[PDB]
Symmetry: D2
Subunit: 295 residues, 4 copies
């Protein structure tokens, strides 16, 4: 037997950082969950019980806190690139670092119409994520994403004209509820190293904001022919607005809301144009994915 | 042996309702999870296999949908009171109905600065809940609550002057992070029946909004001496603003964020006044409760 | 305003203890999650910011570890009683302690037919729990429970003869699937104090084992007329076997498995006597409760 | 813009099947959660709103139930291969099917020492899974796995000799607790089609049982030098026992249990050789992966 692939590290490292403006008194908080996995010349820890090649996962944890102390933690694309670069530069035998960051929302509270200097609310479980792969000699690959963005529209969604055969019971419809949890990922062109990532720092927050805005606007305004058609429109627009993105991937559940026929009860009308009360279905769910790139 | 207490019904009934304004084209959605448990002269179903006394839980489910079709579902205090009253009036041998409703957030989207007519976003997992107990001959008892409201302040929290003995290691502090998930419940005076609940309908949404506002403002503005002291201030204010409330209960976890001593690493300073990076603790957590009533 | 009720303490305290037999080399592990909430003369911490009455929740955490170091942690009824008694005896102004313990399964592994001395497996998420309320001058009240015991029988369950009216669509049946998650609680007679709890130590594990055995056997063997009827039979038997139990409470979801009509597809027969493939329903679910006591 | 990749289908389809032996009266149940995603010539549904190429996800759901009615559902490697093959053969424009199956445990109850004919218990949340990729012209690729197998050993684990630098605080140890949740995957050699999968049917259950047995025995018996070293020993043995496996992958969290220094309290000794009470850590956790193949 032989080791074909190996990676190891520390997962679920929760980190909070506060920034204090001494001039204005305003405080800003950041909270993330971080995972770092390393690869390199470490096969002997597996095959020969040679621990001398192991940077202890406990030390990886320490390094995450130290790096957060000494560097900005925002945008997460930059922090992830700093953290990954550290490992490949510090340890001769480590040749790749894989950094995953989930950013949790702490939104400044408005109290009596004004922004509070040091009080925050978690408005939704929507996350902003990054995956950063730093590979010695091959630069830095960054995938940015938003996830956990849950939306619903109560009309202006259709689904008709699909394949009908002996396995089909679904009725065609010209008016249905459409609800999904949005997972959208944009993959940046490969960067040569940290200097190049630093040069593009302003683009990271701007592209996240654009991706979010395009997602919400397109969902709200499209008279949707299907999840497939609406999601493609989203992806097309993001690629048009940021030339440094190579691909956009969406993964969308179709969270079904079923009509409830109540006609057995005193002829009550609750279907088609008369439908008011629906039964949300926990499962099963449609799952629709697409990756869109440039011509 | 004897049956001392019994209740049975249907839990986890998901319900969505849409309201369509034909004039303006504006649609409004409501989504809830409902549980109804019944009590009454049903002991023989347990002791004698006498199913003739059982309103099937499946029928309870049907009734929830029918009631939602025929009545307003908002405010939830009213819907719960209608639903509970139905069971005690329809079935001679059922003498109490217990209705729990969890309301999920569907917040209208703003697209380009204007409210969208039919598109919604789940902004946070904060819930608005009601528990309604309808008891034949004893009226309607309603407890309203908000839950899952997660907040953090990065300064203006203290904790010193507590009991110190041989079990104590905690250091006194004059500046710490305070973070909690708020669970707040207000209990209404007993109502004589549905007519009286209907008479107070406008107070329900208003009191929910007040409870939320008082909670957020007090948390943000109090230079907190402890969770105990800050929570009491919240409860006192809610009781002062709504005379039809008899008690207010808060249940608050104290979600700890620990300082990380980094001084072992090149003398890095990250404690006390120099603390910037902290480790959020998943567990254990403080749990602080209080019920506040009138003199 | 006035404080009507208050309690505070530490939740989610995870504890592991190992016992090492130096003679045989055999090790035995215990793992629990513990919550302790205190009550007493503590109103001033809420109303006057008087922290001098507060035993810090951090100190409560320390006390749990110290108590586990110095005492047996099994049976959990005994450990909970020791822990609760500690607080009311040590602190003059604390008059009640409420201790909740969840015990997690670590079952010794069998390797090649023999019990391994120090290796364990988590066989199921079934828990054994206790709630211990220690109240100064009123003794010790203990509720013991098992929870998370998930079972299914594929036949020998019926449900017919229930009330039928204009809200009813459910068909009567003489053969259905019955599946539930069992939550069963037995409440002990009040104990005068720790000496009395110690005197009954052997009964705690024995009664847990009996409750479990009676639950499983009755479920498997009863040709069930309803959940109500089968659960009553369980409760009756437990009360008959342990005279020191005052009441038994069961709370049982009815986890539905629906027939799937496939007759639209080439006349395929999959209902009634021909039913082979079913659709488990995540929600809604029946919820059936009963508390059984002595004549 | 262009579609680079697309797949769509139905997730979270819960399925139960019962087998009834008319001779013996013995019933056997199977319960699974199934996901099927399709690929093929479907780009126009995304780019042109051409729904004519879409096999509706609702129809995919129907097909899963029909296929389960007409075929054995065990071993899951066979069921997955039948289900995937169906889609690529039935639809000219569908060229790949991806089938994921999670099998839930329903273990026959022993009542009074004998196996019950129709009563079952969920003993643990351990799962047996398969991923089956059926690609037109390239055969059938199957990955089998077990997951959610949670184990702990209280001694005979060591970790010393790792890299020490200015980021390291971890102490070397010759005796620690080792606990993990096992995720193990074995990848079969590519099969040419369904006939070949059918020819190997007996190997599927046997290899699952072997993988499980080797995992448990190795964990219990190895005086572990590290997670890395112990996991490699497991993988090596599985590859030696089943020649039709090409690779074995393990992904193992290192779930930490920390010593608690109690010496501040009356000199209580609870570290090193005196350690009895430990604090399980929910997070962070080590994460160790390896893929082992043939020379
Ligand atoms: O088994 C281990 N492997 C590791 O890589 C490691 N790092 N810290 N502790 C550890 N334990
Ligand atoms: O066992 C049952 N008890 C009930 O009360 C019920 N109601 N619907 N189905 C049922 N099954
Ligand atoms: O606000 C607090 N209240 C308490 O009771 C406590 N105990 N430890 N830390 C604490 N913080
Ligand atoms: O938008 C949809 N896309 C689909 O592929 C589908 N299949 N069933 N319903 C559907 N809705
Ligand atoms: Na390197
Ligand atoms: Na009545
Ligand atoms: Na006392
Ligand atoms: Na095909
Ligand atoms: Xe952070
Ligand atoms: Xe609703
Ligand atoms: Xe324990
Ligand atoms: Xe199945």
């Amino acid at each position: 037997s032989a080791v074909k692939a190996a990676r190891y590290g520390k997962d679920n490292v929760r980190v909070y950082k506060v920034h204090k403006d001494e001039k204005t008194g305003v405080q800003t908080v950041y909270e993330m969950t971080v995972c770092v996995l390393l690869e390199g010349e470490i096969e002997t820890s597996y095959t020969k019980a040679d621990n001398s090649v192991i940077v202890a996962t406990d030390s990886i944890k320490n390094t995450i806190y130290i790096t957060a102390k000494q560097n900005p933690v925002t945008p997460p694309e930059l922090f992830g690139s700093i953290l990954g670069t550290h490992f490949i530069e510090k340890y001769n035998h480590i040749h790749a670092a894989h950094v995953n960051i989930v950013c949790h929302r702490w939104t400044r509270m408005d109290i009596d119409g004004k922004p509070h200097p040091h009080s925050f609310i978690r408005d939704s479980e929507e996350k902003r994520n990054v995956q950063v792969d730093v590979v010695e000699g091959k630069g830095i690959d960054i995938k940015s994403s938003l996830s956990g963005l849950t939306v619903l529209k109560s009309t202006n969604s259709q689904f008709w004209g699909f394949l009908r055969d002996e396995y089909t019971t679904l009725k065609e419809t010209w008016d249905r509820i459409l609800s999904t949890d949005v997972d959208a990922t944009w993959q940046w062109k490969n960067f040569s190293g940290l200097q190049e990532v630093r040069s593009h720092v302003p683009k990271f927050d701007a592209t996240w904001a654009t991706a979010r805005e395009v997602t919400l606007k397109t969902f709200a305004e499209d008279n949707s022919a299907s999840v497939q058609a609406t999601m493609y429109k989203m992806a097309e627009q993001i690629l048009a607005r940021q030339q440094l993105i190579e691909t956009v991937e969406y993964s969308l559940p179709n969270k079904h809301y079923f009509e409830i026929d109540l006609s057995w009860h005193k002829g009550l009308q609750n279907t088609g144009k008369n439908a008011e009360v629906f039964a949300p279905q926990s499962d099963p769910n449609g799952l629709i994915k697409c990756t869109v790139g440039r011509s």
